[PDB]
C-alpha cells in the first residue's frame, strides 16, 4: 500500500521459504547462499521439509550471546540446489528502537501476510516461554501462534524475526550483520 510494504513484499517474493520442522511451519529467511534463520524453538534437526521438499541441514547454530544467554535466533545452512539474493547489506550493524515496520508472513496457514505494527522499541530482556532472552524488540501488535520465523522490516532494513507475544504485544529477535560475516 507504501513504501514500507514494498520493501517488505520484495523481501518475501525472493527471500523466504515456508520450512516445516516436527514443531510446525515458519516462515523462514533466507540472508545469503544457502543460510537462513528461523526462532530456535523451531528444534531443527538433520533434516527439514523447505517448501514440502526433504532438504538436509548441513549446520544449524542457536545463537547466544557473550553472557550464554539464549538470542532465539538458529542460522541454518541448507543442503539446497540454489542460493538466495545476498541481503546481509540491508542488516543493521548495532542495538536500535525503529519506527514504522511491517511483520510479514508467508505460510500455508497465512499465506501473502503483511502487518503494520508501527514503533518497534529496543525492549532487551525478555522471559520468553521461561527462557531468559537478549536482544529483544517489542511491537504493540497482539501477535498470534503460527507468525514465528515472520519478518520485520522497515525501508531498507531487515531488522529481525518474530518469536512470540503475550496477546498486547508481539516480539522479534534482532538480526545483525556481525551474525552472517562468513
Not at 4 to 9: I, V
Not at 13 to 35: C, H, P, Q, S, W
Not at 81 to 104: G, M, T
Not at 159 to 173: C, E, K, L, R, W
Request: net charge neutral.
Amino acid at each position: 500500500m507504501g513504501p514500507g510494504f514494498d520493501f517488505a513484499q520484495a523481501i518475501m517474493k525472493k527471500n523466504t521459504v515456508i520450512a516445516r520442522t516436527e514443531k510446525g511451519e515458519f516462515t523462514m529467511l533466507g540472508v545469503y547462499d544457502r543460510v537462513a534463520v528461523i526462532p530456535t524453538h523451531a528444534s531443527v534437526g538433520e533434516i527439514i521439509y523447505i517448501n514440502d521438499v526433504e532438504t538436509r541441514v548441513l549446520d544449524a547454530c542457536a545463537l547466544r550471546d557473550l553472557t550464554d544467554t539464549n538470542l532465539e535466533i538458529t542460522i541454518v545452512k541448507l543442503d539446497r540446489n540454489q542460493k538466495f539474493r545476498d541481503i546481509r547489506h540491508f542488516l543493521p550493524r548495532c542495538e536500535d528502537d525503529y519506527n514504522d515496520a511491517v511483520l510479514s508472513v508467508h505460510t500455508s496457514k497465512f499465506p501473502n501476510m503483511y502487518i503494520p505494527v508501527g514503533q518497534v522499541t529496543n525492549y532487551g530482556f525478555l522471559n520468553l516461554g521461561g527462557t531468559p532472552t537478549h536482544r529483544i524488540l517489542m511491537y504493540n501488535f497482539p501477535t498470534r501462534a503460527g507468525q514465528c520465523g515472520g519478518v520485520v522490516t522497515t525501508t531498507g532494513k531487515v531488522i529481525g524475526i518474530h518469536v512470540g507475544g503475550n496477546g498486547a504485544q508481539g516480539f522479534a529477535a534482532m538480526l545483525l550483520h556481525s551474525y552472517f560475516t562468513d
